Amino acid sequence: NRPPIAIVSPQFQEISLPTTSTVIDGSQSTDDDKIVQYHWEELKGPLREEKISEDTAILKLSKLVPGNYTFSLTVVDSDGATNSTTANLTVNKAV
Amino acid sequence: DRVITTSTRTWALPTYNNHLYKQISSQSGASNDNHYFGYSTPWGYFDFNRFHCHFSPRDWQRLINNNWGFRPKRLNFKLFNIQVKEVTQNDGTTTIANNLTSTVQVFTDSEYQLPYVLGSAHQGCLPPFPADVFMVPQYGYLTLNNGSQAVCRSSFYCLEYFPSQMLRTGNNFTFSYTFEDVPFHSSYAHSQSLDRLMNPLIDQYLYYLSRTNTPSGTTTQSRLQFSQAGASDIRDQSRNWLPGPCYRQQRVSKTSADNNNSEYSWTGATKYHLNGRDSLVNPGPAMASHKDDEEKFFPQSGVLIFGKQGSEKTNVDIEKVMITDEEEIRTTNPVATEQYGSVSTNLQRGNRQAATADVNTQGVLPGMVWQDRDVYLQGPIWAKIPHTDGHFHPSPLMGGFGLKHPPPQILIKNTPVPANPSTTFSAAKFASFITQYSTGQVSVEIEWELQKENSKRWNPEIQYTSNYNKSVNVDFTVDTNGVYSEPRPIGTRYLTRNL
Amino acid sequence: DRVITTSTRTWALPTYNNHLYKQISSQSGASNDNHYFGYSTPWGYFDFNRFHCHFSPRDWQRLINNNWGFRPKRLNFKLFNIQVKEVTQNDGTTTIANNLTSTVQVFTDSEYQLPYVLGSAHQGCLPPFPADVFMVPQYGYLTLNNGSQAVCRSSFYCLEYFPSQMLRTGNNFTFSYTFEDVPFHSSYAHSQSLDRLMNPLIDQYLYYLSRTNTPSGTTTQSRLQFSQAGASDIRDQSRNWLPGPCYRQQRVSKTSADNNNSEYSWTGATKYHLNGRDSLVNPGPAMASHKDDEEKFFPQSGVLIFGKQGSEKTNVDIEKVMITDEEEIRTTNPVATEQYGSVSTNLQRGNRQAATADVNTQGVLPGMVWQDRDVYLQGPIWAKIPHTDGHFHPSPLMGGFGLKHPPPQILIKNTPVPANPSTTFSAAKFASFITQYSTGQVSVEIEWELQKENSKRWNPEIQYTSNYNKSVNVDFTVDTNGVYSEPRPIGTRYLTRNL
Amino acid sequence: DRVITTSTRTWALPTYNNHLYKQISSQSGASNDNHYFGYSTPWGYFDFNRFHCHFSPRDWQRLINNNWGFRPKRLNFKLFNIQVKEVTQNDGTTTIANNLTSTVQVFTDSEYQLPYVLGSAHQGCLPPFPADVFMVPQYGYLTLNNGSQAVCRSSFYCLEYFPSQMLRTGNNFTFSYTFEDVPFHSSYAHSQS
Amino acid sequence: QGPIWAKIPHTDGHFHPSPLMGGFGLKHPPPQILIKNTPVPANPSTTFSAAKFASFITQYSTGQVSVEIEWELQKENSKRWNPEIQYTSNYNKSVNVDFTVDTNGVYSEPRPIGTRYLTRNL
Ligand SMILES: [Mg+2]
């Protein structure tokens, strides 16, 4: 079989305060057979406690402080094949 | 109390799949929500499941300005003046000739043994304008899938297995069908709202809690007080009924600056989750599109959206589509973009205040009343009610008549005609054919039953009418190039009735 | 289109309660959810409310591999070859003798005046294997309770008040009953899912919002765009129907390491709250046990769980039980352990993003379709529909036929026979009796109506079949000690139909 | 206690042997076990002697999971919507046209006077899948041989000698046959040895 | 996918005439139905020639053929207690469905299906 392809709707999130919650969609990820696992991971970002690291298709980020973020989405095949793709998020402080 | 529509059109049927049945799937890679597995067949089928394949715009106006209801009674379907043409290309030229010996096969699935695909709003009916010639659509269907793969209960249907009728030039096909007893569609709006059914002159004999605390020196004190509601506190009246069910939709504006600058076409959509995959609810349960004086807002996926003439297939701008709106039912059904209401969440007491919550989803409750979605001139007529153990109020969500035994699928295909065979036997499957296609006339005649309007109201009603001013083109007409267009969606609720 | 089952068994009826009616309650101390109040009676009753009391395993296979539906039509019940035995113990020895003068009393509650207890999945039916002899169960019932105490509306029924039939050796009892018109059970799975009923070859004429913002220089800009859905965006298609209702259950794994290390059998259970007390919902509304390829998961209390032969009563390990699974209905019903879908929660605008929420509870909505729970060979046949003003879709949640007037309770008891009375009158209640019990044959004959399978599918279907390989024991047979066992639960959905 | 199967297919019949009857043999050299002598004819024949030319797989399953036996009772055979095409090649191109005047000859050998070749598991029946179009097989037969040579009792059959039916476009052919009493096939295994 | 019948050879003696490949041995099997295109001569010379005509107009025929067979059945009537063996499709997922056409329109029969699933005693 062919390995899955990870897809993220927004790749340049531009959300500033007071808006503290954005969202990244990974439900568009596609592969010949079906995807059996979704895995989100924050590669970098503002040192804080509220982390997600969840296993859902659509990622919901809340309580986001200002700074730069980078999330890596990893999807898994029914055979075990995987693929990853990165997402960018920027949270600016009010003006 | 009866109106008979009759429509004749000219169709062209090519040979599909080169006569083969093929397995089709999303096995090229898709999202979990987009995976499928099914079969494309070599057959074509006849689709006349839209009101405009039967009613001319003037007929529609006559129907909606004068009737409170209508429903289909019977239909007669015909195929005649059939002719098969053989196409041969030599030296980069095309020659077409008539074959009086070739046939066309017609299978009418009156026992509903094949997957019913009419009822899924597909594009391929008899054109609304009678002078248009149309291509008959290819029949295909889907079965169970697990990703892009099939499972054991997945079904494969071969249509030749069933007995069909053969037609050669000169032969004609007739089919008569009777619709089952179905409720009349309600072609009227209500002149009263559910929360205004009382007599505004007389107070109620019943009481309601009108105050909870009262002045006690310098501060308040807990004290329950009751009042009888009259016209001044009309919101507090005791009532016997509740607004219909709801499944909240997101709200978008026809004014691009009123909307958020992000991608929420999917992330903010109202969905249903079935066997691991999400589907958009569209259009969901019948709800009002907007509340009074907010005509610019509509439910993200809560209304039927038609395309204007010549509109493309993807990422078309809002000026290319005609967004319908169901503001007529706002008298009984909740507004699609707001909460159904509010409900208590805790138990109040001396040191705890009453808390409440919005209810964004509301299943049917005893005492609920509602109106179903409206039908349009360019919308669906019927849908087959799924064959299940239970189906609550089986009125197709896109609008129309839910039928147990809908008009059967009428499938048609060109009989294959082998090209020159070798002179030595070969067990191999025949793969060379004489190129051809058929064409002919099709006429559908439906008898509709009507409920004549009989209003005793004094002032004049609302009627659908053409705009009396001057214009470059007339609505529902052909332009200077011969192109027919439908300028707007025409609903069915002009007349009024009280609740 | 008919199949008649007939079952004969040998029963033994002891004297219960020593002929007394006793008040029973939880008055020894219990939780609020476990309190009760009722009466144990001296009567026994006949229970044949399981499919295996009528169908042999082979009969069941014949039924499920060939029919799309079936429902009960009539029944004939008999008691014969009755014999009463008197037991006398002298010098630590037991002597049993026949009494041709003693009787047995049989009361058939055809007017439903007594609390109906059949329909609560109790263990005491005619054994599935015809050579087993069974003890007739004791009849008891519950009434209203307030803690461990009764209230004024609490009812007390004395069965002698009603006219019964007396039977001595040689007398026999016959009873015929006709079932009311009830829907056929659906013994088939669907070969199509609700979200895949479209023709995958043709696009829809309707549009849906496909994009909300678009590139504008270096950033995006709000802009609504629409598309017509075809096969590549099949999740966005406009549909006419919705999946059935849901009441979310927790998910547990048959693999102990996949589960949390805590006690949530109750704290994490799906419950209903009635008059101050909680009850487990089990099995609740018909839902699919798991989504594709997750056969190891099941609803905490969403499926019927049978015990393997010789399984104990409490805290039995998972290898001792047979967990059923309703994956067949996943084509129309939601998966029991996931959300019904998602719904909009706010109103988006320039400075506010669209927000959504999962719906873990969903009452019926117009346009919803669903399949009821499957019946099993070792499961319930019918249940009495509660006598209430309203009851939506009265299909017993454990599975089976909901009946207004179910087969009546047939109660039986040994007539008391006083031991040697004193020779001087005493008004005191007689408390010394001659020890005895009765025994006899019971035969139940049910006529079932069938809907023969008539599939026009081309490829072969799924059929229930025994495993063709070699084995130490044959399934649904007796072992080397004479013990009969049912190795697995056998459902009824093998054949397939389309939606 | 009855099940009726029905199968319709589209066939193509070329002209065989260029209309000639030819003597055929292994006279080009063969082993003693492979020698033969016979005739290839210009005729084609219809073969529906396989269960899949009548039973769909689902039908077969319905039959085998529910019956202890079955046997054929009667059959009805039809030929219809016949059309003859004439092929003319000019300047390296192919043109096909319809001839409503030409015929097709159909001979049903109900008196079993010709060598019966059905029953030798040959490949040319109505395809199992109903949408397949098949070429009608050429009829040929063998007679007595002594090596690659014939002997005096070797028979030669000319099919035109028999009376056949002529069919032009529009004409159809029907034939009904009743099977003789034959034992039921045993569709069951024994549970005892 | 096997043979239905065979013609029993016309001989003086034939012990238990059940075709060895399987099926129904028949004395008078369904008759051979032979068919052929009538020859149509091409342009003949204008002077008589006794020689055999060897030039023909190239052609072929085509049409529909339908066979309808009525079969008699002996319904299974087992009084056995445990369940029998039945022919069944494999309930698991697969790229292609058995006895179906593939992505190119090619029909295939994946395995041979016999007729002996049900059981009787000896
Ligand atoms: Mg893959």
Residue numbers in the entry:
A (entry chain Z): 405 to 499
B (entry chain A), C (entry chain A): 237 to 735
D (entry chain A): 237 to 429
E (entry chain A): 614 to 735
Text from the published report:
From N- to C-terminus, it comprises a signal peptide, a MANEC domain, five immunoglobulin-like PKD domains (PKD1-5), a transmembrane region and a small cytoplasmic domain.
Size exclusion chromatography revealed gradual oligomerization of several AAVR constructs, so AAV was adhered to carbon-coated EM grids, then freshly fractionated His6-tagged PKD1-2 was added. The more highly saturated binding allowed single particle processing with icosahedral symmetry, yielding a reconstruction with an FSC0.143 of 2.4 Å. A single domain was revealed, fully consistent with the tomography and SPA of the PKD1-5 complex, but now resolving the backbone trace and most side chains, allowing assignment of the tightly-bound domain as PKD2. When B-factors are refined, they account for the expected higher disorder in the receptor ligand (⟨BAAV2⟩=15.2 Å²; ⟨BAAVR⟩=27.7 Å²), and occupancy refines to 0.59. At variable region (VR)-I, residues 263–266 are displaced 2.1–3.9 Å (Cα) and become more disordered through conflict with AAVR residues 123–125. The footprint of PKD2 on AAV2 straddles the plateau that extends radially from each threefold axis, beyond two adjacent spikes. Concordance of the PKD2 structure at 2.4 Å resolution with the ~10 Å view of PKD2 from SPA/sub-volume extraction and the ~30 Å cryo-ET, both from complexes with the entire PKD1-5, argues that the atomic interactions revealed at 2.4 Å are not an artifact of using a truncated PKD1-2 receptor, as does consistency of the atomic model with distances expected from x-MS with the five-domain construct or a near-complete receptor ecto-domain.
